[PDB]
């Protein structure tokens, strides 16, 4: 039998690294009846033209699994979308190394797909403990009108409902907003000064610009943001000591490809040992029916767990959401982010370096404002 691992990557360096990893997988694996083949698909700069290229190359070659690469643009869900659409329901799951979008996790479209990295909402499951550890009896949330933002808000609400907390108020912002100071006006009415918001740099930049003039970044006020707005154009007016979160190994495309190849090497050996081991469908249009090996292949693939790759502790399961990933917390100090906290994906293990609250406060802020004007 011939086993081919098609991959859609950008630049010749990624293709060469993938080919080298595929070649080394054959030597690192004891299988002798299974050969490793390397295929490179350049990122076509056309959504319509990608389908024909994928069908005539990936589908025709009958390769096993398709690798997706991050789009060259800073934020564009086009490169992984064609990969997930061309070979979505054809019993050929597609692996995305940097699929951090929270929308593509409900399995409504392109069911046979997996995420090699946790989404932005996934860190929310670790944020609640980060909120639980640092007191934070009452906090205020702001979610933009985005699918990823809505999913993150739902995950945070589910996490908070364990302790029966309504998170005070959650302001429904919108993407592309340039002036949310008036909407933030109702935020000043809330006694709690903890702001938890997960949006793009465009939506966060306006809020950051409006807060400083509103004196909302002073002592006793805590602003919490995600990794998407941690870096980018939103950091121009970000107050110092902003409690942001970052994910370790966030740009190790070669390491992710190597880990995927290592997982596939064992997956192929596991799959080629049972009855009804049908070959992958052949041809772009030659196939006229769904593959016989359907859910069994996906179940076998989503069951491996070993100490492989730089990240290690690969336990991909459930709908395909990564878990137990290293998180680096860096606080902006004079427009410079220095990693001061390390979370092993289970509990916070911050370094000995101290943390200063926004606006020039070294003490731990309190999110309570009593002595209100009772009427």
């Amino acid at each position: 039998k011939i086993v081919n691992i098609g991959a859609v990557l950008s630049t010749r360096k990624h293709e060469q690294m993938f080919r080298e990893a595929v070649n080394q997988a054959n030597k690192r694996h004891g299988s002798w009846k299974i050969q490793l083949n390397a295929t490179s698909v350049t990122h076509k700069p056309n959504a319509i033209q990608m389908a024909l290229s994928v069908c005539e190359d990936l589908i025709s070659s009958q390769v096993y699994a398709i690798l997706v690469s991050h789009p060259p643009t800073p934020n564009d869900h086009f490169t992984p979308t064609p990969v997930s659409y061309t070979a979505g329901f054809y019993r050929i799951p597609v692996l995305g190394l940097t699929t951090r979008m929270s929308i593509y996790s409900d399995k409504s479209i392109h069911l046979s797909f997996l995420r090699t990295v946790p989404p932005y909402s996934h860190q929310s499951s670790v944020w609640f403990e980060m909120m639980r550890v640092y007191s934070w009896n009452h906090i205020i949330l702001l979610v933009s009108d985005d699918h990823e933002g809505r999913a993150a808000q739902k995950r945070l609400e589910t996490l908070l409902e364990e302790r029966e907390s309504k998170a005070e108020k959650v302001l429904q912002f919108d993407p592309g907003t340039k002036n949310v100071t008036a909407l933030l006006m109702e935020a000043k009415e809330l006694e709690a000064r903890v702001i938890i918001l997960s949006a793009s740099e465009d939506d966060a930049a306006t809020v950051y610009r409006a807060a400083a003039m509103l004196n909302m970044t002073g002592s006793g006020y805590v602003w919490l943001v995600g990794e998407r707005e941690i870096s980018g154009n939103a950091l121009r007016y970000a107050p110092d000591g902003i409690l942001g979160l970052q994910l370790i190994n966030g740009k190790n495309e070669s390491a992710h490809i190597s880990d995927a190849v290592g997982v596939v090497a064992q997956a192929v050996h596991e799959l080629l040992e049972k009855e009804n081991i049908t070959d992958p469908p052949r041809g772009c249009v030659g196939n006229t029916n769904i593959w016989k090996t359907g859910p069994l292949f996906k179940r076998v693939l989503m069951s491996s767990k070993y100490a492989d790759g730089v990240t290690g502790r690969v336990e991909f399961n459930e709908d395909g959401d990564r878990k137990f990933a290293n998180y680096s917390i860096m606080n902006l100090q004079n427009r410079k982010l220095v990693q001061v906290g390390i979370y092993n994906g289970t509990h916070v293990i911050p370094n000995d370096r101290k943390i200063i609250w926004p606006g020039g406060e070294t003490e731990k802020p309190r999110g309570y404002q009593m002595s209100t004007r009772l009427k």
Partner: protein, 389 residues
């Protein structure tokens, strides 16, 4: 005026067969003979894009061995695009007999920027999310038929129910899933009528034992995958020992044809369910043509200029248009839903054309002459059942 004169005040629909002319002609005649189907006095016409070259339509029967289709799809796509441009077909109707043919039709529709609806006998796993191409399945999901039977469980208030299977390989998964949806109903003993019994005395004894067991357990019984002869034999065996209504309620969980549902030999008060009519490919073609005409009329009511003239004026040159005529028609088609000849056709997931067939439920009760006869209890559409009386 200008749009009607340019397009001839007629709407053309393309028909391409990979390997239905009478059905298409009947659909066109039905659409044209009905007033109000299209606005601005638009008449429906059908244009066939066959593999043959350009030429006058000859009324001579030609019998020659057609060669297999070439492996190159570029020539076929170019020919289809040229035919669409020449005929100005708003929608191209495909008849793919395989998933590869359906994918080729979808690719042709995407290249030509026109909506293509492909008729398929059975639904297939579609991975493409392009809204331009749609697939209409002639055969609906079997669970919907069970949804009729479960409708009885949702209308007859028979919490205690039993299932009788004349075959071991019956697809009772749909019926079980439908019954387990509501907690009001309950599932009783399962009756399996094995066909391997050599002696009829043993079968009669087993039937009597099952009837005695289910008399004090469930007042309603549903037959799943029971043939007409098998159901008649079971009813006769039950009536031999005196097991008749209203001691137990008899329901046909499987599809039952009206023609073959003979009144004689059935117990009084028995309940049967069946399709309103035999949904032939002609009925599906007529429903698809009616939906296409309605979508074209809706598009012309807002943008007659774009609806009349397709935006794909070049078979090789593609224009970067944010909203084309094909997308404009596809939006209306996804927003289109009507009660067709083969059933209520609607759009699910913006990519599936689902034709929910109206299931008629009838009860074998007293007729005007006093003999047993099938009285239509009611009709169910989309899972909602309304009694006739």
């Amino acid at each position: 005026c200008q749009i009607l004169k340019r397009i001839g005040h007629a709407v053309r629909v393309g028909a391409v067969h990979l390997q239905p002319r009478d059905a298409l002609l009947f659909a066109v005649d039905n659409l044209n003979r009905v007033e109000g189907l299209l606005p601005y006095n638009l008449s429906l016409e059908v244009v066939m894009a066959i593999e043959a070259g350009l030429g006058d339509l000859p009324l001579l029967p030609f019998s020659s061995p057609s060669s297999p289709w070439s492996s190159d799809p570029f020539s076929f796509l170019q020919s289809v695009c040229h035919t669409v441009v020449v005929q100005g077909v708003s929608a191209l109707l495909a008849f793919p007999q395989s998933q590869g043919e359906m994918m080729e039709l979808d690719l042709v529709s995407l290249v030509l920027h026109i909506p293509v609806i492909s008729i398929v006998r059975h639904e297939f796993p579609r991975e493409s999310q392009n809204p331009l191409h749609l697939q209409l399945s002639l055969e609906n999901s079997l669970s919907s038929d069970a949804d009729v039977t479960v409708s009885i469980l949702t209308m007859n208030n028979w919490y205690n129910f039993s299932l009788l299977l004349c075959q071991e390989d019956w697809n009772i998964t749909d019926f079980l899933l439908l019954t387990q949806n509501n907690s009001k109903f309950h599932l009783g003993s399962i009756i399996n009528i094995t066909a391997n019994l050599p002696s009829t005395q043993d079968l009669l004894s087993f039937l009597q034992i099952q009837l005695e067991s289910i008399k004090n357990s469930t007042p309603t019984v549903v037959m799943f995958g029971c043939d007409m002869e098998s159901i008649r034999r079971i009813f006769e065996i039950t009536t031999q020992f005196g097991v008749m209504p209203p001691e137990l309620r008899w329901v046909l969980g499987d599809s039952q044809n009206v023609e073959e549902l003979r009144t004689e030999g059935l117990p009084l008060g028995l309940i049967a369910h069946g399709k309103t009519t035999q949904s032939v490919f002609e009925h599906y073609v007529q429903d698809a043509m009616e939906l296409v005409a309605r979508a074209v009329a809706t598009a012309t009511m807002i943008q007659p200029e774009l609806a009349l003239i397709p935006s794909t004026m070049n078979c090789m040159e593609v224009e970067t248009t944010n909203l084309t005529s094909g997308q404009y028609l596809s939006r209306f088609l996804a927003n289109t839903t009507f009660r067709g000849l083969s059933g209520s056709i609607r759009v699910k997931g913006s990519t599936i054309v689902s034709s929910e067939n109206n299931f008629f439920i009838w009860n074998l009760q007293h007729d005007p002459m006093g003999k047993p006869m099938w009285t239509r209890l009611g009709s169910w559409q989309g899972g909602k059942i309304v009694m006739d009386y």
